[PDB]
Curated annotation (Swiss-Prot), chain B:
EC number: 2.7.1.140, 2.7.1.151
Outcome of swapping D48A: Loss of kinase activity
Native source species: Arabidopsis thaliana (Mouse-ear cress)
GO molecular function: ATP binding; inositol-1,2,3,4,6-pentakisphosphate 5-kinase activity; inositol-1,3,4,6-tetrakisphosphate 5-kinase activity; inositol-1,4,5,6-tetrakisphosphate 3-kinase activity; inositol-1,4,5-trisphosphate 6-kinase activity
Residues of the full protein shown: 41 to 277 of 286
UniProt function note: Inositol phosphate kinase with a broad substrate specificity.
Tissue note: Detected in leaves, stems, roots, siliques and flowers. Highly expressed in root tissues, anthers, the stigma, pollen grains and growing pollen tubes.
Note: Does not bind calmodulin.
Protein's UniProt keywords contain Nucleotide-binding: yes
UniProt keyword list: ATP-binding, Cell membrane, Kinase, Membrane, Nucleotide-binding, Nucleus, Transferase
PTM description: Phosphorylated.
Protein name listed in UniProt: Inositol polyphosphate multikinase alpha
Keyword Amino-acid biosynthesis carried by entry: no
Localization: Nucleus; Cell membrane
């Protein structure tokens, strides 16, 4: 429940450069007051990915370490740097949003994950593409993810444990695609040590996106 | 026992750019026959680091996963990308190599590691100096070398380097001719179109420690 200490610390932290601040929910203070990200979107497809080569962290209690451990087992969390935990997507041919039960997404394997990452940018639901306008492009997801990556290569302020990337874009017919980080229940001071566990996963994820382009 | 199949595969494999091959013991066939790296060094200080946010891997057996899982706990392996497994260094004041027991380094914490990595480039081991600018830094130094590998590890999905060490070495003789290489390929596997994120993570933390030091 102490997302608060994070936002308190992070939002005012002037050592984090401004172009990286923009990946984070705007904090208005505190009973907690946060910008809704999806507020500017009309018909948005949205996906949330759990970043991290492991979900746990050494400093967690014993009960919460063994918990995360068995959760990770059999997901793409181990095999790849990350885990697709939910999406919701708009089919243009049927004029409708669909959104699979989240339990079901736990069972995805490496091909499963690549397929789904493509569905995310298809009009179907054989997979088409908005890939060039969501993932690709000079202002798309791949570029944004890269900007993030650069930062994670150097920043030693925070360790983002158990924490998720969020992708979203517009369907209403630009795609206006965006990346954000969410879930800070477990962020810790990375005491002069880069968040390698995240950086690991981020890079893997980046490669998946790049395959597709 | 199958470093063989890897060498056989890696040494031929034509998808590895050629400026990367130079970070791997040269192979010559087979009872195995491999260029020894240290041959070119008169008085070398050397260090071997276990790369990896974890040591084990999913495809390993159960006995072997629980083994490493315990081994990892309480070492910079989990905290940082990696784990200094051993080194041997040449104090120029006492004209003498020394080299601490391997177990002892298993106890190192983050500050320990940052110190050790700085010892590794000093003339003192008796407050630490620097050959840091000529081993680590410089346009052909370890930093540049570690960076080249990083780039590569961002893209390459050919091999997963399970449970596998980086080796640094350099010349004490009175330049320092610093060099990086990867060793131990008993557990390599086909990265089935998935980068070696575990390694890449480690390498990146490692790259940062060394960058601090400059």
């Amino acid at each position: 429940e102490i997302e608060v200490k994070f936002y308190e610390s992070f939002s005012s932290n002037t050592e984090v450069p401004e172009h990286i601040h923009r990946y984070f929910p705007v904090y208005h203070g505190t009973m907690m007051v946060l910008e809704n990200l999806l507020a500017e979107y009309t018909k948005p497809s949205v996906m949330d990915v759990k970043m991290g080569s492991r979900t746990w962290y050494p400093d967690a209690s014993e009960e919460y370490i063994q918990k995360c451990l068995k959760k990770d087992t059999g997901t793409t969390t181990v095999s790849s740097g990350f885990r697709i935990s939910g999406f919701e997507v708009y089919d243009h041919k049927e004029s409708s949003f669909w959104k699979p039960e989240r339990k079901l997404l736990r069972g995805l394997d490496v091909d499963g994950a690549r397929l789904t990452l493509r569905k995310f940018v298809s009009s179907n639901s054989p997979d088409s593409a908005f890939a060039s306008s969501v993932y690709g492009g000079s202002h798309g997801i791949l570029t944004q993810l890269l900007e993030l990556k650069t930062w994670f290569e150097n920043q030693t302020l925070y360790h983002f444990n158990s924490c998720s990337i969020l992708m979203v874009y517009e369907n209403e017919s630009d795609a206006r695609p965006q990346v954000k980080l969410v879930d800070f229940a477990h962020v810790l001071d990375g005491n002069g040590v880069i968040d390698h566990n995240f950086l690991g996963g981020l890079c893997s994820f980046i490669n998946f996106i790049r395959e597709i382009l």
